Amino acid sequence: STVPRLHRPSLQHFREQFLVPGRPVILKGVADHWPCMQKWSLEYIQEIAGCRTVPVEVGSREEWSQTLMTVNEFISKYIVNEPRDVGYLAQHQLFDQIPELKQDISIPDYCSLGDGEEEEITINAWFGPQGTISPLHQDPQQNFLVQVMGRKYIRLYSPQESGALYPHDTHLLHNTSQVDVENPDLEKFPKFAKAPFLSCILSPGEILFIPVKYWHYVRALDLSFSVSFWWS
Ligand SMILES: COc1ccc(CNc2cnc(C(=O)O)cc2C(=O)O)cc1
Ligand SMILES: [Mn+2]
């Protein structure tokens, strides 16, 4: 079934029906008027950030590596010029690096329902072409994933389903599923087929609440820019 969409729910409604129980929801009417929604084109990003160095993941989390290049180089090589490989400006605190871009976003008011300090909220950029794919994984904090450019297909599995997701057994990867969500090996991972899940296509202006430790899988359907807020 699908992730519910709610227009600007009250803090109490979000707290009681989603945050405390740990249920995903898409928040509408919250980020849809942030300046990033109209301002962030490739041209604007090049103007404000083009000369800055960013980490770039090449390949798939299959070979995989991490390199460094300017935002201009990343756009030229992995977005516009028939890219030879998938490259992803992933999980980077771009707004600490470039404060002028921080003016174009806000911290969702709902974060103030957490027990942590606003100063400790981690804001990550996720800027990449169509076709970037995460592994199915879980994170140790709450998350508001804000979609700015393009759309993402997202699949969500409750932590109650962890047994059917076959986490890696190394300590380093125990938060990551061994399963390819969209083409699972059911001969090796048979419990995966009957694990229930939620899914959605997250579109610009929408915020997906990913509860702490909820398993999530993310595939970009277009040229995409998302901003995640990791909070507690
Ligand atoms: C090289 O390819 C990848 C591909 C995907 C990834 C990780 N994917 C995500 C994880 N987490 C969040 C989140 O907000 O917690 C968002 C995304 C996302 O892609 O939007 C890393 C490298
Ligand atoms: Mn994540």
Numbering used by the authors: 182 to 242, 246 to 416
Text of the article:
Jumonji-C domain-containing protein 5 (JMJD5) is a 2-oxoglutarate (2OG)-dependent oxygenase that plays important roles in development, circadian rhythm, and cancer through unclear mechanisms. We have shown that JMJD5 can catalyze the diastereospecific C3 hydroxylation of specific Arg-residues in synthetic peptides based on the sequences of human regulator of chromosome condensation domain-containing protein 1 (RCCD1; i.e., R141), with which it is reported to interact in cells, and the 40S ribosomal protein S6 (RPS6; i.e., R137) in vitro. Following the observation that the broad-spectrum 2OG oxygenase inhibitor pyridine-2,4-dicarboxylic acid (2,4-PDCA) is a 2OG-competing JMJD5 inhibitor, we report that 5-aminoalkyl-substituted 2,4-PDCA derivatives are potent JMJD5 inhibitors manifesting selectivity for JMJD5 over other human 2OG oxygenases. Crystallographic analyses with five inhibitors imply induced fit binding and reveal that the 2,4-PDCA C5 substituent orients into the JMJD5 substrate-binding pocket.
JMJD5 crystal structures in complex with the C5-substituted 2,4-PDCA derivatives 20a, 20d, 20h, 20i, and 20j were obtained by soaking the 2,4-PDCA derivatives into apo-crystals of N-terminally truncated JMJD535,36 (JMJD5183–416; P212121 space group) in the presence of Mn(II), which replaces the natural cofactor Fe(II). Electron density corresponding to 20a, 20d, 20h, 20i, or 20j was clearly observed at the JMJD5 active site in the respective JMJD5:2,4-PDCA derivative complex structures. Note that in all five structures, the side chain of S318, which is adjacent to the 2,4-PDCA C5 position, was observed in a single conformation in which it is oriented away from the C5 substituents of 20a, 20d, 20h, 20i, and 20j. Thus, the 5-aminoalkyl-substituted 2,4-PDCA derivatives inhibit JMJD5, in part, via competing with 2OG for binding. Similarly, an electron-donating OMe substituent para or ortho to the methylene linker of 20a did not improve the selectivity of JMJD5 versus AspH inhibition (entries ix and x). By contrast, the side chain of W248 occupies a different conformation in the JMJD5:20d and 20h complex structures, i.e., it faces away from the phenyl group of the C5 substituent of 20d/20h. This is likely because σ–π interactions similar to those observed in the JMJD5:20a, 20i, and 20j complex structures are unfeasible, either because the phenyl group para C–H is substituted for a para C–OMe (as in 20h) that cannot engage in σ–π interactions, or because the distance/orientation between the phenyl group of the ligand’s C5 substituent and the indole group of W248 does not favor productive σ–π interactions (as in 20d). The observation that except for 20e, all of the tested 5-aminoalkyl-substituted 2,4-PDCA derivatives inhibit isolated recombinant JMJD5 with similar efficiency indicates that the σ–π interaction of the ligand’s phenyl group with the indole group of W248 is not essential for potent inhibition.
